[PDB]
Amino acid sequence: KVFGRCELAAAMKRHGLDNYRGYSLGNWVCAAKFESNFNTQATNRNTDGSTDYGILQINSRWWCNDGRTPGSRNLCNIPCSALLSSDITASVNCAKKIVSDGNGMNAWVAWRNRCKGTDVQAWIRGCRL
């Protein structure tokens, strides 16, 4: 599924991402835009043989099992395919573990390079939340 900006803001709000560990909703929407263009089916292969999956591009080296990332961990205890669902619940629950992991949203390279220190409130402007 390709989400609308406000549709995704509403979904993330319902799943408790607004101000989760101090990150306002606009941060999560901004990261999703630049990681996946709001497409739950996005996949991208890394030089190391790991893959990134879903609207928040969660990596198979640490967070999910895809059966082809040798010597990887499965810290969210899910198959990486669960992250491609139109239902974002698995992606949001896994993201909450990642952001708790010590580096905050700096885990998402697109957030650090394209959202951090910008007016992220712009991403939820005009939405009924």
Q: Residues within the annotated binding site for substrate?
A: 101
Q: Which of 9, 2, 1, 3 has its CA nearest to residue 125? A: 9
Identify whether 35 is a catalytic site residue: yes
69 binds Na ion (CB under 5 A): yes
Q: One of 18, 52, 66, 87 is an active-site residue; which one?
A: 52
Q: Which of 25, 41, 43 has its CA nearest to residue 95? A: 25
Rounded Cα gap, residues 29 and 88, in angstroms: 13
Q: What is the smallest separation between the CB atom of 124 and Cl ion, expressed in angstroms? A: 5
Total number of residues that touch Cl ion (CB under 5 A) = 15
In three-state secondary structure terms, 65 is strand
Which positions from 21 to 60 touch Cl ion by CB under 5 A, shown as an x/- string? ---xxx----------------------------------
Q: Which residues are catalytic?
A: 35, 52
